[PDB]
Amino acid sequence: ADSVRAYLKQIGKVALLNAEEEVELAKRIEAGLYATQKLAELAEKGEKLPVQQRRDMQWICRDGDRAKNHLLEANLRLVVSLAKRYTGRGMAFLDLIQEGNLGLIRAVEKFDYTKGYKFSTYATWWIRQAITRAMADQARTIRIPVHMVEVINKLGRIQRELLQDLGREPTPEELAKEMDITPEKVLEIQQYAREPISLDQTIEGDSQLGDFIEDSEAVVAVDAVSFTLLQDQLQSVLETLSEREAGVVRLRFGLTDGQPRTLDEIGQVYGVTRERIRQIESKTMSKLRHPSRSQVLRDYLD
Amino acid sequence: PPRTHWDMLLERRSVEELEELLKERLDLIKAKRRGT
Amino acid sequence: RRQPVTVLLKALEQIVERFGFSEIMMGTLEKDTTSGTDEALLDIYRKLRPGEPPTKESAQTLLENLFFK
């Protein structure tokens, strides 16, 4: 009928364990893990083993995984027990549950039975960390990193505490001193904490927001034509200049090629010292400023 | 170079502790087949 | 749709005696197959939570937790 309703149906099909049961599973899971590593090291070093001993060693490797999976399936209810408390903070319940299961996995990987502590005592840390670590990683569409997500929560914490001490929302200078940071830092943090909004959202009636965004780089027909008319006007001026003079002005700004060129690079094509190119440039520019040549382009200024 | 289940196990128990554990586990299967 | 009208009081004797005035109400009751308080509370349970095996405690807290607290 419902997705989550289906998952709880199946996790409940495994009976919860007791302390002695946990310790045993934690032993077999550990022996199988060492039995596996032992055999791998042997091939590198040689060290063949008794044909029979190797047989029941490989079975211990195989047997440890049943202990691993049996231990996980028994404490799945614990994950859901912890995940419920974090719904509605930007993550679906199932995603919280799965990330919690990841923490449960490591808890099993890192569990120590010799300490004699109940499993739920230690596994709760890993499930809680795996869920919150996941929320910082995913809950936001723009994905602030963890340390920055940590300072945001700490800042809001401070504002909350202070608000009760002061009776009013604090000013940036007060939060800056209370957190031991600069007032321009806390302001920069409050800009990061902004969360996005949906274009597909609608605003009054039947009009989605998305239809109001301008395309900035869209070609504006009134300017692109004048640009074409402008580059034709410049083509006229070049015919008035000396053939060497017109060639220099282009290459310096790369009108034909589309890329500028430095003087030394303009010296190779014309086989002259780069200073001479600078001199020719200066004389030709001043002549371009001459009253006759530039009169038309004044109006084309903007 | 990840951090694997072996690394996490070796960090908390020496090879002599693991070896003695393996010996116990080996004797269990040893008793099963040998002793009725 | 159309839970038997009798199952609700079974969820909560002499059901016929106190309401003997209505002839049709007794006709619907005669058509109701459930008998007893716990046996019919399972009938009403199956439709409220489709997919959960009832518990002896959950059956009784089901009806009271729903509408009376």
Identify which of A213, A222, A240 has the alpha carbon closest to the alpha carbon of residue A295: A240
**Cα gap B6→A40, rounded to integer Å:** 12
Q: How many other CB atoms are there within 10 angstroms of residue A82's CB atom?
A: 21
Q: Which amino acid is at A245?
A: E
The string of DSSP codes covering A162-203 is: HHHHHSSPPPHHHHHHHHTS-HHHHHHHHHHT-----TT-B-
A190-217 exposure pattern, b = at least 16 Cβ within 10 A, e = fewer: eeeeeeeeeeeeeeeeeeeeeeeeeeee
Q: C29: how many CB neighbours lie within 10 A of its CB?
A: 16
Query: For A53, left (φ over 0), alpha (ψ -120 to 50), or beta?
Result: alpha
Q: How far apart are the first and last CA of chain C?
A: 24
* Deposited experimental method: X-ray
Facing residue for A30 by CB, picked from B9, B30, B33: B9
> What distance in Å separates residue A182's CA from the closest CA in chain B?
38
Residues 6+ away with beta carbon under 8 Å from A16: A74, A75, A77
Burial of A174 (0-12, 13-18, 19+ CB in 10 A): middle
Residue A138 corresponds to which tokens in the numbers above? 């995913």
CA distance A275 to A14: 87
At what resolution in Å was this solved?
3.0
- B5 vs chain A: nearest CA distance in angstroms? 6
Closest CA to C51 of A5, A169, A178: A5
For A32, how many CA atoms within 13 A lie in the half-sphere containing its CB?
A: 19
Collect all residues of chain A within an 8 Å Cβ-Cβ radius of residue B9: 30, 33-34
CA distance A289 to A277: 18
- In three-state secondary structure terms, A99 is helix
Identify the residue whose tokens are 């504006």.
A220
Burial class, B13, CB count within 10 angstroms (exposed 0-12 / middle 13-18 / buried 19+): middle
Contact C42, C56 (CB under 8 A): no
In whole angstroms, what is the distance from residue B3 CA to residue A209 CA?
A: 48
The CA distance from A112 to A116, in Å, is 8
CB A55 within 8 A of CB A81: no
Q: Is the CB of residue C34 less than 8 Å from the CB of residue C4? A: yes
Q: Report yes or no: C21 and C44 within 8 Å, Cβ to Cβ.
A: no
Residues A97 and A7 sit within 8 Å (Cβ to Cβ)? yes
**CB neighbours of A23 closer than 8 A, spacing ≥ 6?**
A113
Phi and psi of A254, rounded to 5°?
55, 50
What residue of A is the nearest CA neighbor of C52? A9
- Paired residues of A208 in beta bridges: A202
Helix ranges (DSSP H) in A47-181: 51-74, 76-83, 93-110, 119-138, 146-166, 172-179
Residue A212 to residue A181: CA distance in whole angstroms: 39
Say if residues A26 and B5 touch (Cβ distance below 8 Å).
no
**B-chain residues near A111 (CB < 8 A):** none
**Cα–Cα distance measured from residue A222 to residue A211, given in angstroms and rounded to the nearest whole number:** 23
State the Cα torsion B21-B27-B32-B33 to the nearest 10°: 130
In angstroms, how far apart are the furthest CA atoms of chain A?
Answer: 105
| CA B14 to mean position of chain CA atoms | 11
Residue with tokens 């200073």: A275
